[PDB]
Amino acid sequence: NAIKYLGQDYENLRARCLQNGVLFQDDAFPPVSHSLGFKELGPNSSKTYGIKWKRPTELLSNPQFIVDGATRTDICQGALGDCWLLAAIASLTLNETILHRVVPYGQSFQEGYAGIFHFQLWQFGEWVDVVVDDLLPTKDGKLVFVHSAQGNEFWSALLEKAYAKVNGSYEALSGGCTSEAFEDFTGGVTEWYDLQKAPSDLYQIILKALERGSLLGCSINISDIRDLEAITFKNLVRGHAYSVTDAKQVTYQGQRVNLIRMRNPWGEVEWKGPWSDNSYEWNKVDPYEREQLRVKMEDGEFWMSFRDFIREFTKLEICNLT
Numbered sequence: 273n274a275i276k277y278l279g280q281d282y283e284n285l286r287a288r289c290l291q292n293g294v295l296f297q298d299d300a301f302p303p304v305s306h307s308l309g310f311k312e313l314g315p316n317s318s319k320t321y322g323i324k325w326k327r328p329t330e331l332l333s334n335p336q337f338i339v340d341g342a343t344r345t346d347i348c349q350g351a352l353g354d355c356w357l358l359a360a361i362a363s364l365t366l367n368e369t370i371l372h373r374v375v376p377y378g379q380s381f382q383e384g385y386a387g388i389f390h391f392q393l394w395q396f397g398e399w400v401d402v403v404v405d406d407l408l409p410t411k412d413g414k415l416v417f418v419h420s421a422q423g424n425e426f427w428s429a430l431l432e433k434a435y436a437k438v439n440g441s442y443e444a445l446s447g448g449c450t451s452e453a454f455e456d457f458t459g460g461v462t463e464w465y466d467l468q469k470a471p472s473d474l475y476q477i478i479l480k481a482l483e484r485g486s487l488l489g490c491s492i493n494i495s496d497i498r499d500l501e502a503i504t505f506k507n508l509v510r511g512h513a514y515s516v517t518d519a520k521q522v523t524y525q526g527q528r529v530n531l532i533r534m535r536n537p538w539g540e541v542e543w544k545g546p547w548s549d550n551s552y553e554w555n556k557v558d559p560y561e562r563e564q565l566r567v568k569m570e571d572g573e574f575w576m577s578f579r580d581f582i583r584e585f586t587k588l589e590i591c592n593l594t
């Protein structure tokens with residue numbers, strides 16, 4: 273069993289709040305500006321001033337912890353520099369086993385609800401259980417930070433809040449390393465690859481990792497500083513964490529082509545080159561392959577050929593488990 277972060281005991285706190293007729297408020301990460309941040313989200317900042325802390329049960333009549341499963345579409349980035357963390361959460365959802373260690377079963381806004389949730393992280397060399405109250409930063413009734421494409425679903429907002437808590441504040445999450453979040457979800461071994469010096473068998477390495485449920489992420493280095501914009505000519509975002517979510521092969525005019533699928537944790541803004549949702553390449557594959565693989569949706573997720581992938585991206589990170 274996970275040991276309790278700060279000695280806070282989820283089931284005991286929940287049961288005592290229920291008995292006492294109150295909702296949990298977390299002394300260890302309270303609903304005040306110091307939990308938001310210190311500079312950009314400090315007590316005297318423009319961003320801090322508009323934010324009000326509200327529970328999902330104050331926002332909606334029927335809030336849900338999980339709706340139609342805990343999946344990657346549930347990860348839509350808000351106003352914070354935590355793309356690395358969110359890419360890691362999106363990847364985590366592809367492995368049901370490790371997903372449900374991090375996100376314990378049986379949490380809800382219905383029977384037994386007392387305004388407290390918990391998650392498990394690999395921290396301080398231990399598996400630790402971390403509680404949060406469900407007060408969330410909002411503005412005009414909408415979540416400021418991570419949210420689900422399903423507007424009534426809250427597990428990912430709550431997980432991001434627990435991760436903020438262990439790190440001291442939401443602002444503490446701005447700017448980071450995908451591999452760090454990978455490790456914090458698995459206690460696994462991380463490795464990275466320089467895509468400009470990719471091993472000849474890299475695609476097979478990727479296939480194998482995806483098969484075993486390893487976590488994969490990629491990024492494009494900003495080499496000049498930010499000159500050719502944050503966004504590239506083909507609509508990729510530089511200095512930004514993407515989740516790698518699949519690797520599949522297609523028959524393009526009678527010849528195999530290796531493809532790779534990734535997801536922008538914004539839940540929008542995608543590659544517009546070959547193999548993108550609207551590209552001509554799909555016209556020339558097996559109709560079945562097209563129907564199985566292509567999804568015409570602005571959802572942040574898209575395909576590239578492996579060839580284009582290794583040209584456009586610069587870094588690949590893989591976290592391997594047991």
Ligand SMILES: *[C@@](O)(C(=O)NCCCN1CCN(C)CC1)[C@H](CC)NC(=O)[C@H](CC(C)C)NC(=O)OCc1ccccc1
Pocket residue numbers: 349350351352353354355356446447448449450490491492510511512513514538
């Ligand atoms: C990352 O790209 C990010 O979080 N961007 C925020 C985008 C804001 N969205 C835009 C869309 N709308 C709808 C919602 C708001 C982030 C920006 C800093 N990138 C990273 O953190 C980098 C990830 C790597 C995989 C490239 N890492 C990084 O910048 O490292 C810096 C660093 C390292 C150590 C300590 C501090 C900072």
Ligand SMILES: [Ca+2]
Pocket residue numbers: 338339340341342343346420422425
């Ligand atoms: Ca969902």
Ligand SMILES: [Ca+2]
Pocket residue numbers: 542549567568569570571572573574
């Ligand atoms: Ca898409």
Ligand SMILES: [Cl-]
Pocket residue numbers: 280298299300
């Ligand atoms: Cl407490």
Ligand SMILES: [Cl-]
Pocket residue numbers: 304305315
């Ligand atoms: Cl304040």
Ligand SMILES: [Cl-]
Pocket residue numbers: 335336337338379380381382
């Ligand atoms: Cl629920």
